[PDB]
């Protein structure tokens, strides 16, 4: 248990400073690989009010054999059999995702029962810690998926960042009531507190549409970025893919951020609500 | 009814579909009206059931409206293997269910919670299924219902002998059946999942949660490849604890039914 | 319990009162705490029951708090004829009643409606009484409860075989007992009136409404002339359909208890 | 830490099957000792809307030297300096009590910082577990203190008993959401669950007025009883004290329960609200 | 004001009390009206302050009503060591506090939260205290106020440079002082606890929570033994991290003030 957790943590650290990109087909995977993505996340190829489920394993197998970077897939919240199936397929990581249709409205997957590490979403520290408590090895913000608007991600990033530095301030007495307020396990609160940060890798996700969005999230202390619609719905996916990677790798160098933002084309249109 | 354990019952609108079901390894078919959008949904014409029954040798089931004891008398004459008093048809009596004790044909009824289940059994049902959310291809309500019932059963099973009375008053359920439920540690009749099952993964999930089998309809015949979908769901139900086999019957399935999220 | 039909049970606080009761023709006495105003009302000291029991040869009853199965175990050891799990004492368990099936001593319980009655019988009561409104000398709630139960019983008794299920769910009562109640055309245990009875006229009224007997307490020992009041109530209950006798035992009774109207 | 917790647990086990009694003076202590009490709990001697604080240490010292049974005292919730003072006085146990006036409306004492074991109150399983999480070594129901009415204790005893046997039923998946519902630490929930009971000694308290009240609480699975007003406000404190002890030591023997209830006198008058 | 660190200021109504305070080791006394129940509470008569000041050599403080800048001008003439613009007197201006920058005498003001504290400092206060709940002998509100301020300070101290602006708008407090507060990691003036302190244990508790000292009034002079209570509170404040000494000065104290819980 102890060791199997450390093993998954060792593996996820490899992702720090990386960009994972959402792909619908091989051409998209290749673009992503070409751009410097440390991984791709495979999505249903949709040409509707549909139930969104985990993708057909065969479509994952087809894309994975045409690239050599990491390969991730999504399962429905609480759908432990979709996870069992993808575990058997030897995928690199699973995302128990709120963007797919919930399979169980009360329980998340017990992620301790898998060898494959999981990523999960959060908008705040209690939620993050409850996902880690259930066994997630990595966390991301939920942001606002598919809108091309960065505002919710930013809020989620600032909310967890505060609660974390505050928790770090509280006296040994006050920490209990805060645990009860976050409805989070005191063990992981104390650990967040001796580490001075989130105890697992923590990426931004949802709404990233420009190099400037990506670096902002990094300047706020994130370990990396998921991007989807911002790339493949831009005017020039390939150039946008590469500039976002560069930005993530250089998020403190305004001169490179300028450079990679020149003549980028139109960013995804987006949706303000 | 005990025969049915480990099986898949499939909803069919015609003989082609019925044969696909039989070929898949379905242990029974449930015959439905064949519709080409409100509109009253009633018992099928007995003729149609008779046409299908004669072209297969698996079990045959039909639906009657809630409270409609005359639709049931008519189908009883027809010598069908089982009737489903079904909320998916238009209710006929908003207060009373059929008194199922007056039929020789076993009935199946739906539930979302233990008390409802037990009221249906009290009325004479020989089998129970969840209601899930029919025709949506979304598994979430089925899971809710399965878990709601499993919990209430296990909780019940722990309660001290004096506490059962007040619980029985909260379930609004008969104490005989409550005590039997707590002595069997499960539900006292065969108990299947139904409504929303659209993939092999969905079907195995219900089985991993303790169900005795599954009803599937739209998820097969609105998928890309009904024959391959139907066969994979059967394997899944038979092999629900074998993830290697659940992988294999999901490879290259085509698109599952589109569904509707509300 | 069938012995008790046509009788009067009287509440006594000491031997003097107990003898007045016996002399009147009471078929039993119910022993109460002797209080000289909130304050918790518990089981009587067994010693006191023992002192009174030895000075009479009629039946002897005591009260326990609702849910207090240990007060009941203690009195069970004492070999009393009947216990009353009584709302007039301070409840001990706000959710659960005593499981009365674990005692050899019969229990009596209160009710205001058929479903409550039947829940108490399910829990093991051997006798039922109305709750009326104890200690007020006002008959109105008792009459309400008697009529509420009589109606629900007669209504039940008419219902078609399929309608009983939904009714049983509304009474929140066991269907076995409901069906038995409809087959006896009355309540399946001895059933007395209690709370508020202050005159011979009041006692006969409950009997004319179908009750098997009566419990009286304050109405006797807070009247002007307890011995004459007690004896007249006994005659009344024995002669409830004879208005000439009901006149005669009401002449010159003195003042009935004062009461309280709310 | 691990060992200091085991040490306090070892000590509290000594109390199983015992009756602790609340005393205001030496005469009361002596009565309690004579009756078979394994301990007394010392209270302010009040001859008013007063702030109720921990008692003067001197009054504890005076009573303790006239008996040889265990001696307990009360502190105000969140008042860690009252506890520091009584720790230095070498008292046997402290009760962080809701019957005294709260000193801190958000935080309880961090009880891990003391050698003296603590008892705390609860009305339900989350609350119990949060008190253990903070360091309590023993728990009691809150009941309804001073009313002579057993009804609230019973409710509190039944509430924790259920949640405990249910928790014991849930699948390894469902346990997380229940943890979040009880706002309790998953660690102690899992432990309650492998022990099949409350992980610390658990006594009934508040409203016990007859031998019959005491045994009822034991028949419902409690490890023992606190009694106060029921004894010293009865007609015959000494006889009531001894009968309650006997009942607790014999809570399953109806014949002894009868025997010790004969000619007891009047029980405390009480208050129904 | 920095002189005052580690001290106890005590409220006195006359010379006897003032001497008890001085004898105890109080670093100052706060002079109060001597009252033998609504009624308007105003500045003390300067004569009375003058009588007491002359019989002691510790520091001397008096109260003025909130907003009453003329009471303050009068006491300023009198050459007192400190004024307390105090919510315990009847407010004189419901919207504005005294502009304390126009006096040479330092002021102390109350607060329950960081923003209030900082508004008072902006208005010119040289010292701050909590409000607690005066005259009740209940420590709970003081603890609340101490913790509310400590948290907001430590939180503030963590905030990134851009986040401070919106926080300053929520505290409704000046950004200069906010930035100073975050650079000192504490409050930029001397900061005492006040209201409700009734035992040595209470006084040490505030000190263990980071306060620079304490104000006590009713807790001494309404205890059984004011001289012994006063001396023990002084030792406690001087030795707040020494539990062995906190035990010793609490032995045999007599009764603390009765208090009022609301």
- D154 neighbourhood in chain C, CB within 8 Å: 67, 92-94
C-alpha–C-alpha distance, residues A207 and A142, integer Å: 9
Count of positions (residues) in chain C: 262
Query: How would DSSP label each residue in A58-105?
Result: HHHHHHHTT--SEEEEEEETT-HHHHHHHHHTT-SEEEEETTSPPS-S
Mutation choice for A interface testing from D125, D132, D175, D183 by most A CBs within 10 A: D183
C-alpha–C-alpha distance, residues B126 and B98, integer Å: 13
**With an 8 Å Cβ cutoff, is A108 touching chain D?**
yes
Which run of H or of E encompasses B84?
A: strand B82-86
SS3 content of chain B, % helix, strand, coil (to 5): 40, 15, 40
Across the D:E interface, residue pairs with CB atoms under 8 Å apart total 78
- Nearest in space to A145 (alpha carbons), one of A17, A36, A41, A253: A41
Backbone angles phi, psi at B75, to 5 degrees: -65, -30
Phi-psi region of D169 (alpha: psi -120 to 50; beta: other; left: phi over 0): alpha
For chain E, the maximum distance between any two Cα atoms, rounded to a whole number of angstroms, is 56
Kindly determine whether residue C166 and residue B96, on different chains, have CB atoms separated by under 8 Å.
yes
Backbone angles phi, psi at B212, to 5 degrees: -95, -5
- D106 neighbourhood in chain A, CB within 8 Å: 174, 177
- D162 neighbourhood in chain B, CB within 8 Å: 155, 158-159, 163
C-alpha–C-alpha distance, residues B115 and B178, integer Å: 9
- Nearest in space to C198 (alpha carbons), one of C139, C246, C253: C139
Chain D: touching chains (3 or more CB pairs < 8 Å):
A, B, C, E
- A127 neighbourhood in chain D, CB within 8 Å: none
Which run of H or of E encompasses B31?
A: strand B28-31
Count of positions (residues) in chain D: 273
Beta carbons within 10 angstroms of residue B25's beta carbon: 16
- D159 neighbourhood in chain B, CB within 8 Å: none
C-alpha–C-alpha distance, residues C29 and B5, integer Å: 60
Beta carbons within 10 angstroms of residue E21's beta carbon: 29
Using alpha carbons only, how large is chain E's radius of gyration in Å? 18
C-alpha–C-alpha distance, residues B174 and B109, integer Å: 17
**With an 8 Å Cβ cutoff, is A90 touching chain B?**
no
Listed in order, strand segments (DSSP E) in chain D are 19-23, 39-42, 70-76, 93-97, 118-122, 138-141, 201-205, 225-227
List, in sequence order, every residue forming a beta bridge with D140; answer none if it has no partner.
Answer: D121, D203
- Answer whether C60's CB lies under 8 Å from C81's CB: yes
- Answer whether B204's CB lies under 8 Å from B237's CB: yes
Q: Is D68 helix (H, G, I), strand (E, B) or coil?
A: coil
**With an 8 Å Cβ cutoff, is C2 touching chain B?**
no
Q: Is D20 helix (H, G, I), strand (E, B) or coil?
A: strand
C-alpha–C-alpha distance, residues E88 and E41, integer Å: 8
C-alpha–C-alpha distance, residues E94 and D268, integer Å: 52
- C161 neighbourhood in chain B, CB within 8 Å: 99
Kindly determine whether residue D169 and residue B155, on different chains, have CB atoms separated by under 8 Å.
yes
- Answer whether E174's CB lies under 8 Å from E124's CB: no
For residue D58, count CB atoms less than 10 angstroms from its CB and return exposed for 0-12, middle for 13-18, buried for 19 or more.
middle
**With an 8 Å Cβ cutoff, is D48 touching chain B?**
no
- Nearest in space to D133 (alpha carbons), one of A177, E229, C89: A177
Distance from CA of D97 to the nearest CA of E (A): 15
C-alpha–C-alpha distance, residues E217 and E195, integer Å: 8
**With an 8 Å Cβ cutoff, is D54 touching chain E?**
yes
Q: For D209, which of C40, C77, C91 is closest by C-beta distance?
A: C40
Mutation choice for D interface testing from B158, B166, B182 by most D CBs within 10 A: B158
Q: For A169, which of E147, E155, E163 is closest by C-beta distance?
A: E155
Chain E: touching chains (3 or more CB pairs < 8 Å):
A, D
Query: How would DSSP label each residue in E120-159?
Result: HHHTT-SEEEE---TTS---HHHHHHHHHHHHHHHHHHHS
Q: Of chain B residues 176-205, which have a CB less than 8 A from chain C? A: 176
- Nearest in space to E136 (alpha carbons), one of D176, B128, A126, D51: D51
Is chain E touching chain B, with at least 3 CB–CB pairs below 8 Å? no
Resolution of the solved structure (Å):
2.4
- C175 neighbourhood in chain B, CB within 8 Å: 122, 174
C-alpha–C-alpha distance, residues E174 and E256, integer Å: 41
Count of positions (residues) in chain B: 262
C-alpha–C-alpha distance, residues B199 and B233, integer Å: 7
List, in sequence order, every residue forming a beta bridge with B7; answer none if it has no partner.
Answer: B213
Beta-carbon contacts of residue C65 (< 8 Å; ≥ 6 apart): C41, C42, C43, C71, C85, C86, C89, C90, C91, C92
Residue C172's alpha-carbon distances to A80, B116, B172, C120, in angstroms, are 39, 13, 5, 12
- Answer whether B33's CB lies under 8 Å from B64's CB: no
Residue A232's alpha-carbon distances to A37, A38, A235, A238, in angstroms, are 14, 17, 8, 8
Query: How would DSSP label each residue in D106-124?
Result: S----GGG-SS-EEEEESS
Q: Is B218 helix (H, G, I), strand (E, B) or coil?
A: helix
How was it solved?
X-ray
C-alpha–C-alpha distance, residues E221 and E31, integer Å: 13
Backbone angles phi, psi at D202, to 5 degrees: -140, 110
Dihedral sign (CA D104, D108, D111, D117):
positive
Which residue in E63, E154, E169, E185 is the catalytic one? E63
Q: For A180, which of D110, D173, D183 is closest by C-beta distance?
A: D183
C-alpha–C-alpha distance, residues E149 and E128, integer Å: 11
Would you state the structure tokens that stand for residue A10, as one six-digit string?
A: 């060792």
Beta carbons within 10 angstroms of residue C247's beta carbon: 11
- Nearest in space to B159 (alpha carbons), one of B147, B170, B143: B170
Kindly determine whether residue C67 and residue D212, on different chains, have CB atoms separated by under 8 Å.
no
Chain A: touching chains (3 or more CB pairs < 8 Å):
B, D, E
| Chain B: residue whose CA lies nearest to D221 | B160
Which residue in B63, B100, B104, B170 is the catalytic one? B63
Kindly determine whether residue E154 and residue A174, on different chains, have CB atoms separated by under 8 Å.
no
Is B63 noted as a catalytic residue in this protein? yes
**With an 8 Å Cβ cutoff, is E242 touching chain D?**
no
CA atoms within 13 A on the CB side of E148: 21
Which residue in C5, C13, C63, C169 is the catalytic one? C63
Q: Of chain C residues 59-88, which have a CB less than 8 A from chain B? A: 69
- D261 neighbourhood in chain C, CB within 8 Å: 45-46, 74
Domains and CATH numbers, chain E: 1-262 (3.20.20.70)
Q: For E138, which of D57, D88, D101 is closest by C-beta distance?
A: D101
Kindly determine whether residue B201 and residue A82, on different chains, have CB atoms separated by under 8 Å.
yes
- Nearest in space to D45 (alpha carbons), one of D70, D68, D26, D30: D26
Q: For A165, which of E147, E151, E158 is closest by C-beta distance?
A: E158
Beta-carbon contacts of residue E140 (< 8 Å; ≥ 6 apart): D101, D102, D103, D104, D105, E133, E196
Query: How would DSSP label each residue in chain E?
Result: -GGGTTEEEEEESSHHHHHHHHHHT-SEEEE--------------HHHHHHHHTT--SEEEEEEETT-HHHHHHHHHTT-SEEEEETTSPPS-SS----GGG-SS-EEEEESSHHHHHHHHHTT-SEEEE---TTS---HHHHHHHHHHHHHHHHHHHS-TTTHHHHHHHHT--HHHHHHHHHHSS-SSEEEEES---SHHHHHHHHHTT-SEEEESHHHHTSS-HHHHHHHHHHHHHTTT-HHHHHHTTTT--PPP-----
Distance from CA of D80 to the nearest CA of E (A): 8
- Answer whether D124's CB lies under 8 Å from D160's CB: yes
Which run of H or of E encompasses A13?
A: helix A2-13
Q: How far is CA A173 from the centre of its chain?
A: 34
C-alpha–C-alpha distance, residues C69 and D110, integer Å: 39
| Chain D: residue whose CA lies nearest to E236 | D81
Mutation choice for A interface testing from B135, B201, B225 by most A CBs within 10 A: B201
**With an 8 Å Cβ cutoff, is C252 touching chain D?**
no
- Answer whether C75's CB lies under 8 Å from C54's CB: no
List, in sequence order, every residue forming a beta bridge with B64; answer none if it has no partner.
Answer: B85
- D149 neighbourhood in chain C, CB within 8 Å: 40, 90
- D254 neighbourhood in chain C, CB within 8 Å: 73-74, 76-77
C-alpha–C-alpha distance, residues B220 and B210, integer Å: 23
Beta carbons within 10 angstroms of residue C54's beta carbon: 10
Residue B182's alpha-carbon distances to B176, C101, C102, D220, in angstroms, are 10, 18, 19, 20
Count of positions (residues) in chain A: 273
Which run of H or of E encompasses B204?
A: helix B200-208
Q: For B138, which of A51, A56, A61 is closest by C-beta distance?
A: A51
CA atoms within 13 A on the CB side of B178: 30
Chain B: touching chains (3 or more CB pairs < 8 Å):
A, C, D
C-alpha–C-alpha distance, residues A98 and A268, integer Å: 22
Burial B230-255 (b: 16+ CB within 10 A, else e): bbbbbbbbbbbeebebbbbbbeebee
Residue B11's alpha-carbon distances to B14, B52, B76, C80, C169, in angstroms, are 10, 12, 19, 64, 32
Q: Is C198 helix (H, G, I), strand (E, B) or coil?
A: coil
| Chain C: residue whose CA lies nearest to D214 | C70
- Nearest in space to D164 (alpha carbons), one of D132, D137, D140, D188: D188
Using alpha carbons only, how large is chain A's radius of gyration in Å? 18
């Amino acid at each position: 248990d102890n060791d199997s957790i450390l093993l998954k943590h060792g593996w996820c650290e490899m992702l720090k400073g990386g960009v994972i990109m959402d792909v619908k087909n091989v051409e998209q995977a290749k673009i992503a690989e070409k751009a410097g993505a440390i991984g791709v996340m495979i999505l249903e190829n949709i040409p509707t009010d549909g139930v969104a489920r985990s993708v057909d394993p065969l479509k994952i197998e087809e894309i994975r054999k045409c690239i050599s970077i990491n390969v991730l897939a999504k399962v429905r919240i609480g759908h432990f059999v979709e996870a069992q199936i993808l575990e058997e397929l030897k995928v690199d990581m699973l995302d128990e995702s709120e963007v797919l249709t919930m399979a169980d409205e009360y329980n998340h997957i017990n992620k301790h029962k898998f060898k494959t590490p999981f990523v999960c979403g959060c908008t705040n520290l209690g939620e993050a810690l409850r996902r880690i408590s259930e066994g997630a090895s990595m966390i991301r913000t939920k942001g606002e998926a598919g809108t091309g608007n960065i505002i919710e991600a930013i809020k989620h990033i600032r909310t967890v960042n505060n609660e974390i530095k505050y928790l770090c301030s509280l006296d040994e007495s006050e920490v209990y009531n805060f645990a009860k307020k976050l409805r989070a396990p005191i063990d992981l609160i104390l650990l967040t507190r001796k580490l001075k940060r989130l105890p697992v890798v923590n990426f931004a996700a949802g709404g990233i549409a420009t190099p400037a969005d990506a670096a902002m999230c990094m300047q706020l202390g994130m370990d990396g970025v998921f991007v989807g619609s911002g790339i493949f719905e831009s005017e020039n996916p390939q150039k946008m893919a590469s500039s976002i990677v560069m930005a993530v790798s250089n998020f403190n160098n305004p001169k490179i951020l300028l450079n990679v933002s020149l003549g980028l084309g139109k960013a995804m249109h987006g949706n303000t609500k």
